[PDB]
Design a protein around this motif. Structure first.
Motif, PDB file in Angstrom:
ATOM      1  N   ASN A  23       0.865  -1.187   0.000  1.00 41.20           N
ATOM      2  CA  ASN A  23       0.000   0.000   0.000  1.00 41.20           C
ATOM      3  C   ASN A  23       0.888   1.218   0.000  1.00 41.20           C
ATOM      4  O   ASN A  23       1.878   1.236   0.713  1.00 41.20           O
ATOM      5  CB  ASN A  23      -0.883   0.004   1.246  1.00 41.20           C
ATOM      6  CG  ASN A  23      -1.962   1.078   1.208  1.00 41.20           C
ATOM      7  OD1 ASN A  23      -2.700   1.190   0.240  1.00 41.20           O
ATOM      8  ND2 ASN A  23      -2.049   1.857   2.295  1.00 41.20           N
ATOM      9  N   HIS A  24       0.545   2.253  -0.759  1.00 41.67           N
ATOM     10  CA  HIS A  24       1.345   3.493  -0.786  1.00 41.67           C
ATOM     11  C   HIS A  24       0.418   4.679  -0.997  1.00 41.67           C
ATOM     12  O   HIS A  24       0.230   5.125  -2.118  1.00 41.67           O
ATOM     13  CB  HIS A  24       2.442   3.454  -1.850  1.00 41.67           C
ATOM     14  CG  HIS A  24       3.570   4.400  -1.580  1.00 41.67           C
ATOM     15  ND1 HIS A  24       3.399   5.757  -1.360  1.00 41.67           N
ATOM     16  CD2 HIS A  24       4.907   4.171  -1.515  1.00 41.67           C
ATOM     17  CE1 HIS A  24       4.586   6.303  -1.150  1.00 41.67           C
ATOM     18  NE2 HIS A  24       5.517   5.366  -1.241  1.00 41.67           N
ATOM     19  N   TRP A 268       4.263  -5.767  -5.387  1.00 42.17           N
ATOM     20  CA  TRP A 268       4.165  -4.311  -5.389  1.00 42.17           C
ATOM     21  C   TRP A 268       2.694  -3.903  -5.148  1.00 42.17           C
ATOM     22  O   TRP A 268       1.975  -4.563  -4.395  1.00 42.17           O
ATOM     23  CB  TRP A 268       4.847  -3.789  -6.659  1.00 42.17           C
ATOM     24  CG  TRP A 268       4.987  -2.285  -6.796  1.00 42.17           C
ATOM     25  CD1 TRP A 268       4.664  -1.551  -7.892  1.00 42.17           C
ATOM     26  CD2 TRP A 268       5.507  -1.347  -5.819  1.00 42.17           C
ATOM     27  NE1 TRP A 268       4.929  -0.235  -7.677  1.00 42.17           N
ATOM     28  CE2 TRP A 268       5.441  -0.064  -6.424  1.00 42.17           C
ATOM     29  CE3 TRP A 268       6.020  -1.456  -4.511  1.00 42.17           C
ATOM     30  CZ2 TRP A 268       5.838   1.091  -5.765  1.00 42.17           C
ATOM     31  CZ3 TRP A 268       6.443  -0.314  -3.871  1.00 42.17           C
ATOM     32  CH2 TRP A 268       6.335   0.950  -4.503  1.00 42.17           C
ATOM     33  N   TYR A 269       2.235  -2.797  -5.713  1.00 42.84           N
ATOM     34  CA  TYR A 269       0.927  -2.259  -5.351  1.00 42.84           C
ATOM     35  C   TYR A 269      -0.143  -3.336  -5.424  1.00 42.84           C
ATOM     36  O   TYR A 269      -0.361  -3.958  -6.465  1.00 42.84           O
ATOM     37  CB  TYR A 269       0.541  -1.138  -6.301  1.00 42.84           C
ATOM     38  CG  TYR A 269       1.397   0.101  -6.303  1.00 42.84           C
ATOM     39  CD1 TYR A 269       1.904   0.660  -5.135  1.00 42.84           C
ATOM     40  CD2 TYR A 269       1.638   0.776  -7.491  1.00 42.84           C
ATOM     41  CE1 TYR A 269       2.619   1.844  -5.164  1.00 42.84           C
ATOM     42  CE2 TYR A 269       2.336   1.959  -7.513  1.00 42.84           C
ATOM     43  CZ  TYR A 269       2.795   2.510  -6.352  1.00 42.84           C
ATOM     44  OH  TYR A 269       3.498   3.704  -6.316  1.00 42.84           O
ATOM     45  N   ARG A 272      -3.876  -2.088  -8.656  1.00 41.76           N
ATOM     46  CA  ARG A 272      -3.231  -1.473  -9.821  1.00 41.76           C
ATOM     47  C   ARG A 272      -3.662  -2.272 -11.047  1.00 41.76           C
ATOM     48  O   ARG A 272      -4.017  -3.452 -10.934  1.00 41.76           O
ATOM     49  CB  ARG A 272      -1.701  -1.462  -9.698  1.00 41.76           C
ATOM     50  CG  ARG A 272      -0.994  -0.287 -10.340  1.00 41.76           C
ATOM     51  CD  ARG A 272      -1.339   1.017  -9.633  1.00 41.76           C
ATOM     52  NE  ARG A 272      -0.541   2.113 -10.157  1.00 41.76           N
ATOM     53  CZ  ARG A 272      -0.877   3.387 -10.055  1.00 41.76           C
ATOM     54  NH1 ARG A 272      -1.984   3.760  -9.427  1.00 41.76           N
ATOM     55  NH2 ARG A 272      -0.085   4.297 -10.583  1.00 41.76           N
TER      56      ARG A 272
END
Length: 390
Positions: A23-24, A268-269, A272
């Protein structure tokens, strides 16, 4: 004629820590409440993730943005690890690296200040109900064109002389490609090794021959081994449902588990257009590939030795639940032809497997039960499929 595989329940390998993603909420939009449930719940139509990775912002005014998703993940059963990309700017200096100017590094006189920054993050998150499982020294210190570089020796100095002051498990070095030159100095120094808790690595361009790590087999007792970031086979926009491309995700996970002995695999995410959750909040083909592991191979299961590649294009892994000696086998068939395998599981009392199958046309479809003939389970894998047997 027929290919054979053996699962050896007595040959225990790594204990599984779990599966998840990033999460970002500064770079992209946070997960929404509904998406948090889809990611970290393990009900129908949910991914069953048990690891959330977050970033440690260089600006502490952004830290509050992490809290809602991290709290919910923990509530749903996940653990949380945090990685920094840059120190606060007052701790950084520039230098020229391989002829490229204006690159960033942590000032040598600020290693203690950086420990305090990391500890402040740990304490802030704890006060907000987020007890971090681990915190990393640096995301991709060896691919830091757009963030903060650390040489193997800078990383060693920090691990040896400073990291023992961090009030959390310490993760390092998160090489972009699991390059062993970034981690060997840590493993070879007794104090640095003592200060390490989790060997973290990313998998970008990492080939199967580079997944074993003999020095970690020697020196890693009591340490965890996590693959903390990848996307595969690309980050193309709107790629997450491409088929049979998505099979590369399952294959990469298989490889991490069986060739690398990794205890955790973190995308990663999470949300997305190339990720396990699409922008509409639904699971993509790449997400179902992850789910074949994450929904079934729960934290605390232990991988066991099993014939990994019983016939061309077929890949098998197996993990055991030590509470009842049941087994979860994940079998990938990348072939355009169906494949029939005789799977021997000597010494099991299990006589029936249920199975869930993903292809280009169905997702985690429950298919007919497998009945053992004694301790042998004969299975036919559909073309271009993943099957989890439970």
């Amino acid at each position: 004629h027929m290919a054979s595989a053996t699962i050896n329940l007595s040959a225990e390998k790594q204990v599984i820590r779990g599966f998840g993603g990033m999460n970002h909420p500064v770079w992209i939009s946070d997960l929404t409440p509904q998406q948090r449930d889809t990611a970290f719940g393990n009900g129908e139509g949910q991914l069953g993730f048990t690891i959330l990775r977050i970033h440690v912002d260089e600006n502490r005014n952004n830290w509050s943005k992490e809290v809602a998703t991290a709290r919910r993940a923990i509530e749903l059963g996940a653990i949380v690890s945090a990685s920094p990309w840059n120190p606060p700017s007052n701790m950084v200096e520039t230098f020229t690296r391989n002829g490229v100017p204006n690159q960033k590094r942590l000032r040598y006189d600020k290693y203690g200040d950086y420990v305090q920054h990391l500890n402040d993050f740990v304490a802030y998150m704890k006060s907000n109900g987020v007890d971090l499982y681990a915190i990393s020294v640096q995301n991709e210190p060896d691919y830091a064109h757009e963030w903060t570089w650390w040489t193997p020796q800078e990383m060693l100095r920090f691990m040896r002389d400073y990291a023992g002051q961090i009030n959390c498990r310490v993760m390092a070095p998160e090489s972009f490609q699991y390059l062993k030159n970034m981690s060997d100095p840590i493993l070879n120094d007794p104090q640095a090794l003592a200060n390490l808790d989790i060997l973290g690595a990313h998998f970008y361009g990492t080939t199967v021959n580079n997944m074993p790590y003999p020095l970690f087999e020697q020196k890693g007792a009591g340490k965890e081994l996590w693959m903390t970031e990848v996307y595969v086979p690309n980050s193309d926009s709107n790629s997450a449902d491409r088929w049979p491309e998505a099979l590369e995700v399952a294959h990469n996970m298989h490889n991490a588990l069986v060739e690398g002995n990794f205890q955790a695999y973190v995308w990663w995410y999470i949300r997305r257009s190339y990720g396990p959750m699409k922008e509409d909040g639904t699971i993509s083909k790449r997400g179902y590939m992850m789910a074949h592991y994450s929904k079934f191979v729960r934290p605390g299961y232990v991988r066991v030795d099993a014939t990994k590649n019983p016939t061309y294009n077929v890949y098998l892994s197996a993990c055991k639940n030590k509470k009842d000696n049941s087994v979860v086998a994940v079998v990938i068939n990348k072939s355009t032809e169906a494949k029939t395998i005789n799977i021997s599981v000597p010494g099991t009392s299990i006589r029936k497997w249920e199975r869930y199958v993903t292809t280009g046309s169905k997702n985690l479809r429950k298919e007919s039960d497998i009945n053992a003939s004694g301790t042998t389970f004969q299975v036919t894998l559909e073309p271009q499929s993943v099957t989890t047997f439970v």
